[PDB]
Amino acid sequence: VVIGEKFPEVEVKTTHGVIKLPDYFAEQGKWFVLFSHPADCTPVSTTEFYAMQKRVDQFRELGVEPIGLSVDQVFSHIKWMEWIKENLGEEITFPVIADDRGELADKLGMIPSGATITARAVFIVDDKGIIRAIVYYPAEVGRDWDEILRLVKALKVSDEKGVALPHKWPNNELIGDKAIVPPASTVDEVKQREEAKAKGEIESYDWWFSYKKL
Template identity: 55%
Template sequence: MGEKVYELKKIKKKGKGMPLIGDKFPKMEVQTTHGMMKLPKAFKGKWFVLFSHPGDFTPVCTTEFVAFQLRYELFHELNCELIGLSVDQVFAHLKWIEWIAENFDVDIEFPIIADTGKVADLLGLIHPNKGTNTVRAVFIIDPQGIIRAMLYYPQELGRNIDEILRMLEGFQTADEKEVAIPANWPCNEIIGKGLIIPPAADVETAIKRPEKYKCFDWWLCYRNYYKW
C-alpha cells in the first residue's frame, strides 16, 4: 500500500484548523515546477522551508526569489531545501522564472507549488479580504516533519532571507546542544555568540551551575559556542 496522503476536502469536513508550531506538517501531494511531489516525504531527513508569495510577476516577490536563490547553497549547507507556493498555474511559474533568468541572470533551482487554492487554504495562507492571493508566509519544517516556525509578512514588506537562515542555524544549534538561543544571536548584546543554558530544575543543580558555566544569576547561565 502506498503512503496515505491527506485529501484536503476531507480535512475541512473533519473540522481541523490550520496547523500550528509543534504540529506535524500535513501530508499532501502537490503539483510543482519540478513535477508532482509528496510533502513532507520529498524532503525526508532534511529541513525544508515552504514560503508562499502573493503572485508571479510581482515586484517584491521577484526580489525575494532572487534573494532566496542567491543563498540557496547556504540553505543546503544547513541540510535545508526550499519550496515556493502561490495560487498560479505551472506555466505562469515557468514563464516568471524564465523572466528572472533573462533579466537578472539568476536561475531559480528550487520547486514552486502551483496551487489551486486547496493547500493555501489548509495552511491558512489566504487572507479573507485579499481574494485568492496567498499571504507572504514562511514555514520552517524539521527532518521529523514538525513545524518549527511560522512567519507572516504584509504584502508591502519583503522577507529578510538572512533571518530565516539565522533561525535555521539557531534551531539546529538548540537541538544539538540542548540550549536556548539569545536575541540577535550570534551577535547578542550581552553574551555575544554564547548559548543559554536552560534554567536549573532543582536547588543542587542551581548551586553547581557557576562551577561549569558563566552565570549572571542561577537562572541566567550561558556557555561559549563551539562545534564538536
Template identity: 45%
Template sequence: MPIALGEKVPDFTVNTSKGPITMSSYKGKWVLLFSHPGDFTPVCTTEFMAFTERYDDFKKLGVELIGLSIDSVFSHIAWIRDIKEKYGVEIPFPIIADVNKEVANIFNIINPADGMTVRGIFIIDPNQKVRWMAYYPAEVGRSISELIRVLKALKFNWDRKLATPANWQEGDPGVMGAPGTLEESYAREKDGAERWYLKRVK
C-alpha cells in the same frame, strides 16, 4: 484547522515547477517553505532572486527551499523563464502550484481580502514539525540573512539542546532552559550561572 507552531505537517502531494513532490519525502531534512502573493509581482521577484543568491548557504545548512503560490504551474514556468531572461538568475528550487489552495489552507496563508496567498514562511524540522513561522505584509520583502540566522539558531538548538538569546549569532553562547525545581535553581547559582534562571553555555 490550520497548522500551529510545533505541529506535524500533514502529508500532501502537489505539482510544482519541477514536477510533483510529496511532503513525506522530505522527512529527515530541514525545509523552508515560503509563499508569495503572485507571480510577476515586484517584491516577490526580488525575493526569489535573493533566495537564489543565498541558495548555496541554505544547501550548506542542509535546508531545502520550496516556494508556493496559488498560480498555475504554467505561470510559474513563465515567470521563472522571464527572471532568467531579464536578470540572468535561474531559480533552482521548486515552486508549488497550489491552484486548489490545498497547501495554503493547511498553513492558513490565504488573504480573505483578495483570496491570494500572503507572504508566509515556515521552517519545518526533520521530524516534519513546524518550528518557526512568520507572516509579512505584501509590501514588505523578507530578510534572507535573518532567515538564515533563525535556521542556524534552530539547528543549534536541535544539536546542542540549548536555546539562543536575543540577537544570537553563530558562535555565540546558548542558554540553558530555566530550572524546574528549587534545588536545581540553587545548583545553578553554585555552578556559576549569572542568575539562577539564566545560564549561558559556550
C-alpha cells in the same frame, strides 16, 4: 496549524513535478523552508526569488531545502523563472508549488482577510515533519532571508547542543554568540550540564540565567 504540529501529509504539484510533503524532504533527513508569494511576475516577489536563489546554497549547506508557493499555475511559474534568468541572470534551482486551487494555502492560513491569493508566508519544517516556526508578512513588505537564515541556524544549533538562543543570536547585546543553558529535564541533561560547569564552560547573571559558548 501551530508550532509543534506535524506538517500535513499533502501531494503538491511543482516545477520539479509532483512531490509528497513533508516526506520528500523528511525521508532524505532534510528540513524545508516553505514560503508563499501572492502572484508570479510581481516586483517584490521577484526580488525575493532573486535573493533566495543567491542564498539557495547557504540553506542547502545546512540541510534545509527552499520550496516556494503561489496559487498561480505551473506555466506561470516557468515563464516567470525564465524572466528572472534572462533579465537578472539567476537560474531558479528550487521547486515552486502550484497551489492552483488554494488547498495547501488554506490549510496553512496563508490567505489574508477577504483575499483569494496568499500573503508572504514562511514555514520552517524539520526532518520529523514538525513545524518549528511560522512567519506571515503582507503583500506590501518583502521578507529578509538573512533573518530566516539566522532562525534555521539557531533551530539546528538548539537541536544539536540542547541550548536556547538569545535575542539576535549570534550578535546578542549581553553575551554575543553564547547560547543559554536551559533547565535539566533528564538525568543526562543534569550530567551533561554538571560536566560543562566542571569544564569551566558555564557563566551566569543568576541561578536561573546561565549561558556558555559552542
